[PDB]
Amino acid sequence: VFIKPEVFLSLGIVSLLENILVILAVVRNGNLHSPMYFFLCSLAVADMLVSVSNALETIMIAIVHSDYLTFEDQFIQHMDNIFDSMICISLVASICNLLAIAVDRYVTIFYALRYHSIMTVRKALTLIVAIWVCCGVCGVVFIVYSESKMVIVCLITMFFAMMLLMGTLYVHMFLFARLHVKRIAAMKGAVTITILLGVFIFCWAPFFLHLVLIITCPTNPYCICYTAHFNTYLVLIMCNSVIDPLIYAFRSLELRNTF
Amino acid sequence: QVQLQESGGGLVQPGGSLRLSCAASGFTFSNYKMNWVRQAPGKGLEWVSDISQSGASISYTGSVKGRFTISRDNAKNTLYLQMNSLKPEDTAVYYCARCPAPFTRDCFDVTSTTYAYRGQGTQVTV
Amino acid sequence: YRMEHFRWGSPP
Amino acid sequence: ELDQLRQEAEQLKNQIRDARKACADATLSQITNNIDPVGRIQMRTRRTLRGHLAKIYAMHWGTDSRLLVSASQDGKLIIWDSYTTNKVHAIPLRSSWVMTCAYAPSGNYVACGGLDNICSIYNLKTREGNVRVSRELAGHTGYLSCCRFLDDNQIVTSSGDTTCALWDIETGQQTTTFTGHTGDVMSLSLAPDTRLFVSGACDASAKLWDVREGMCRQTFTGHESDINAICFFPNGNAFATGSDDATCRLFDLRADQELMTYSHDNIICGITSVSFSKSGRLLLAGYDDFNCNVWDALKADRAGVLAGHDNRVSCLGVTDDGMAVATGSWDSFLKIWN
Amino acid sequence: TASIAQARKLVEQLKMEANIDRIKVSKAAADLMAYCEAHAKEDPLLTPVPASENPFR
Amino acid sequence: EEKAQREANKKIEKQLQKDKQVYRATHRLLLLGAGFETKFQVDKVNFHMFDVGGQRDERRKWIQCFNDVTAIIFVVANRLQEALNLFKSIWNNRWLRTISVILFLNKQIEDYFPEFARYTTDPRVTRAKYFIRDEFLRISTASGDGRHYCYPHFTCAVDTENIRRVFNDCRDIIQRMHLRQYELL
Ligand SMILES: [Ca+2]
């Protein structure tokens, strides 16, 4: 039920290192003005945000546990509201970037000839800016405005919609690749698809399954001892932030070479 | 300077056998794969056979397959062609050719009208 | 005020 | 007939070879045995120039040692300031397949050519201020490999139809044609006095040509495969060649034979470009393994490596005051080293 | 006539190239070496300059 | 005056950023073999084909300036063995080792290809067609490593539906390239 902040700090620092390496490898090399790597950079920034926000909140809890007390009520609430807003911004940013990468891959494969005309650099930057702006607005509103309300419904519906969308896109892409394998012959895709979708689900679904229980069955204990390891779900989300550069940017040969 | 000198040939009755030799100098023999090319009287240059840097890969043109044998001696820097059971269609001039660059797997321009790394050729009349 | 790790840790 | 003339040619070749062997008094290595080695040459990238979409095929410095021109196969010619990394000119080409470029000694003109078998001359100093095709010289049969302005009105081209030519830009007609090669001519190098030049070809031979008389004077045959690049020693009494046998070689015009060979056991890729430093002590050479090497030309051992490119190095050049070295590459980036 | 004019030209060119003056290898090698020592102090890539005099610092 | 130099530089880059968009939205095709540039467009996508018939018979030096085309179109009509040899040397070149080939058998035997007597697919013409197609495909499916493939077709008509085929294999080439890059194929 309780987690020592040592693991929180370790996960935060390791995610910071990996995302710094990813950003440096992207910026240093000539892998620029290709929308493939802009989304990787945006996702790395969002993962860094989740990691650092959680590490800072744990260190603040540890410090203000017993000493260094400034004020009783106003200061503590004021200081932790901004941390919670930062984490709520970074969660949505991470999910939206994971989805934007999938949509980009789908467009490259199923619009192979008309690509480079329906997705330019200007459109990639517009998309990134709009995604981050909307995510920030929602992350502020979901905390500073009363979160003891029905905002959780809109918080879990959006996650389930993006999960279904990602699954559909990647399954169609793999099924299409199977036809090409058949035509060549007349696997790798399964492993890749299972890794991507399993990491996504195993890291993100437990938290939102925790969320749905507190608004559906908050009193009955039938499979409600589920919402007692609530901190392990944050641990898993930071684990996702650690893993994301391993399966997205470090699979690229050029990014491997530069770093 | 790169030199390839061909020897052997002459007039032979159908069903006979000949052994053409190609002596090479001016380069490292062991880094290049070598070919036999042929020009018949009235047509253009035609590929006949080739062999790799060590002798593992050997290729023949279809018509001569089964009765021509190619070999090379890297220690003595020479290339051979054994031609048994000859036919009247075989009267032609035979040239010994070399690939443009060492260590490669693509032989380009070996049967052009003007190549720089092929010999002067010997006449074989059947 | 009670300080926790992130919002929605106990039912509203 | 044919046999008698071939026998005469063989006799003359043997006579030439034995005459050359009579003059091989000593080797270059023994004479420079008591010379102190250069050391280890560490060079660093100062500027990196990024404006080209496709691979780069050629470059050429100016005489002021500050501006330079570069050619890329997307169909582009770019003039850069090496000090500040600006972009003075960008010229779109009529054909997208360009293999050579050059800079006039005065600085008012540039030239290019490629798979269109034409040499295009561009006037930078337009009265209106816009670069336009001043001249279009078209009499070659195969592609163009190199070009080098003699002055504002004369230019020498080498073609893949196995000929070289000297042009007259005012009238646009060939003045002299140099015909002795039996393969594509790949490079040429004008003498400091611009009275002779050398050309290396795909018959694995090099030739020295007299510009005024239009005749070949000497032929040098040491390599084993096609010659890709050729340079000229600073005092004009020697030159260097790089080829597909993964070696470089140095030749002397007065001794009429090869002096030194620059090769190593683990280098098995062809040389694409060579150049000399200001004193003639360092020979720079670009390779197919994506980096350049530095050779102590008097002692024939490596003194440094320039590894900064991710694709094949196509062009390489040294300034007139000898302070910087520019290299181009197939990854579309030029790099300046100091 | 086709392949007998080229032999004539090759023979004439070899005659032209066979009678020229040749100096020994020692002389040319010594000349190159002496030129190298004459300009050794003006080679920026060989004798690196102080950072004050480097336009590409 | 440095302000004017910066301004001219910025104009140059503003034009180059517009040029990059057009360069990346076209597909360049080499048309060696048989029958100088010619642009065209199908279904609102632009193709750019080059025929190099103005050169000489030695190809090893100018062939490598085509190492970034999307596909090579090899047209073929002992004249079959020289085509097979040219295909073999193009397939194995160091700079053309990721380029795919669209092959057009314009010819639409047992003395020059003696293995035809032991080959089973009037049926004689179809047997010969598939024998030759299998010759080229036996060369192509030997040292590819999955970075390029061969697309053989049979053409003898007025060449009406020959441009739809190029469209459909230039789509497949890029689709397979991306599916292979994403580790899905
Ligand atoms: Ca909180």
- Chain centre to alpha carbon of residue F158: 21
Rounded to a whole number of angstroms, the distance between the first and last alpha carbons of chain E is 65
CA angle in degrees (0–180, nearest 5) for F14-F19-F21: 105
Residue type, F143: S
CB-CB neighbors (< 8 A) of A30 in chain D: 50, 331, 333
Residues 6+ apart with CB under 8 A from A61: A5, C3, C5
Q: What's chain D's Rg over C-alpha atoms?
A: 20
Furthest CA-CA distance within chain E: 69
Q: Looking at chain F, which runs of residues are DSSP E strands?
A: 26-30, 37-42, 45-50, 71-76, 100-105, 150-154
β-pairing verdict for D334-337 and D325-329: antiparallel
Is the CB of B46 less than 8 angstroms away from the CB of F94? no
CA distance A13 to A5: 12
Residue A241: closest CA among A14, A15, A4? A15
The answer to whether D257 and D238 have CB atoms below 8 angstroms apart is no
CA distance A131 to A46: 11
The answer to whether D314 and D290 have CB atoms below 8 angstroms apart is no
| F52 marked ligand binding residue | yes
Half-sphere exposure of A160 (CA within 13 A, CB side): 10
CA distance B98 to B110: 7
Place of tokens 């000493």: A67
Residues 113-152 of F with CB under 8 A from A: 149
Residue A248: phi, psi to the nearest 5? Answer: -120, -55
The answer to whether D275 and D61 have CB atoms below 8 angstroms apart is no
Report the DSSP beta bridge partners of residue D71.
D58, D77
Place of tokens 């070399």: B98
The answer to whether B52 and B92 have CB atoms below 8 angstroms apart is no
- Chain centre to alpha carbon of residue F112: 27
Say which experimental method was used: cryo-EM
CB neighbours of residue A240 within 10 Å: 18
CATH code assigned at E47: 4.10.260.10
Domain ranges of chain A: 5-258
Residue type, D332: S
CB neighbours of residue F102 within 10 Å: 24
CB neighbours of residue A65 within 10 Å: 10
Is the CB of F81 less than 8 angstroms away from the CB of B112? no
Residue D211: closest CA among D167, D179, D166? D166
CB-CB neighbors (< 8 A) of A122 in chain F: none
| F108 marked ligand binding residue | yes
CA distance D9 to D290: 42
Rounded to a whole number of angstroms, the distance between the first and last alpha carbons of chain F is 56
Range of the structural domain that residue E13 is part of: 4-56
Q: What's chain E's Rg over C-alpha atoms?
A: 23
Residues 6+ apart with CB under 8 A from D280: D233, D234, D235, D297, E32, E35, E36, E39
Residues 32-61 of F with CB under 8 A from A: 43-45
Q: What is the CATH number of domain A5-258?
A: 1.20.1070.10
Option in D28, D281, D324 nearest E29 (CB):
D28
CA distance D261 to D245: 12
Is the CB of D184 less than 8 angstroms away from the CB of F54? no
Residue type, A154: C
CA distance E53 to F12: 31
- 3-state SS assignment for residue A12: helix
* Domains within chain D, CATH numbers bracketed: 1-337 (2.130.10.10)
CA distance D163 to D142: 9
Residue B69: closest CA among B51, B52, B92, B56? B51
Place of tokens 């070149």: F93
How many angstroms away from the CA of E14 is the closest CA of chain D?
Answer: 6
How many angstroms away from the CA of A118 is the closest CA of chain F?
Answer: 10
| F33 marked ligand binding residue | yes
Question: Where would I find the H helices in chain A?
Answer: 5-28, 35-63, 74-110, 121-144, 151-185, 188-216, 230-247, 253-258
- DSSP letter string, D137-154: E---SS-EEEEEEEETTE
Is the CB of B100 less than 8 angstroms away from the CB of D245? no
Residue type, D182: T
Does D203 touch chain B if contact means CB atoms closer than 8 Å? yes
Closest residue in chain C to residue A208, using alpha carbons only:
C8
- 3-state SS assignment for residue D125: coil
CA–CA distances in Å: residue D98 to residues B19, B21, D58, D116, D119? 48, 44, 9, 8, 10
Q: Resolution of this entry in Å? A: 2.9
Half-sphere exposure of D6 (CA within 13 A, CB side): 6
CB-CB neighbors (< 8 A) of D50 in chain A: 30
CA distance F96 to F150: 13
Place of tokens 């025929």: F51
| F57 marked ligand binding residue | no
CA–CA distances in Å: residue D234 to residues A117, C7, D197, D276, D278? 52, 77, 13, 8, 7
Residue type, D37: P
Q: Which two tokens stand for residue D311?
A: 């694709």
CA distance A102 to D141: 52
Residue A27: closest CA among A10, A3, A11, A44? A44
Question: Where would I find the H helices in chain F?
Answer: 2-24, 79-91, 123-140, 162-181
Q: Which two tokens stand for residue D178?
A: 């140099």
How many angstroms away from the CA of D111 is the closest CA of chain A?
Answer: 29
The answer to whether D199 and D210 have CB atoms below 8 angstroms apart is no
CA distance A36 to B8: 64
CB neighbours of residue E19 within 10 Å: 9
CB neighbours of residue A228 within 10 Å: 10
Does A232 touch chain F if contact means CB atoms closer than 8 Å? no
CA–CA distances in Å: residue D176 to residues A110, B26, D179, F59? 58, 33, 10, 27
Closest residue in chain D to residue A32, using alpha carbons only:
D50
Taking an 8 Å Cβ-Cβ cutoff, which residues of chain F contact chain D?
A: 5-6, 8-9, 12-13, 15-16, 19-20, 23-24, 37, 50, 52, 54-56, 58, 61-62, 65, 68
CA distance A115 to F24: 10
Residues 6+ apart with CB under 8 A from F56: D141, D142, D160, D161
Residue F180: closest CA among E10, A220, A189? A189
Burial category of F185 from C-beta neighbours within 10 Å (exposed 0-12, middle 13-18, buried 19 and up): buried
CA distance A12 to A83: 15
Place of tokens 């589920």: A226
Residues 6+ apart with CB under 8 A from D187: D145, D146, D158, D199, D200, D227, D228, D229, D230
CA distance D74 to D58: 13
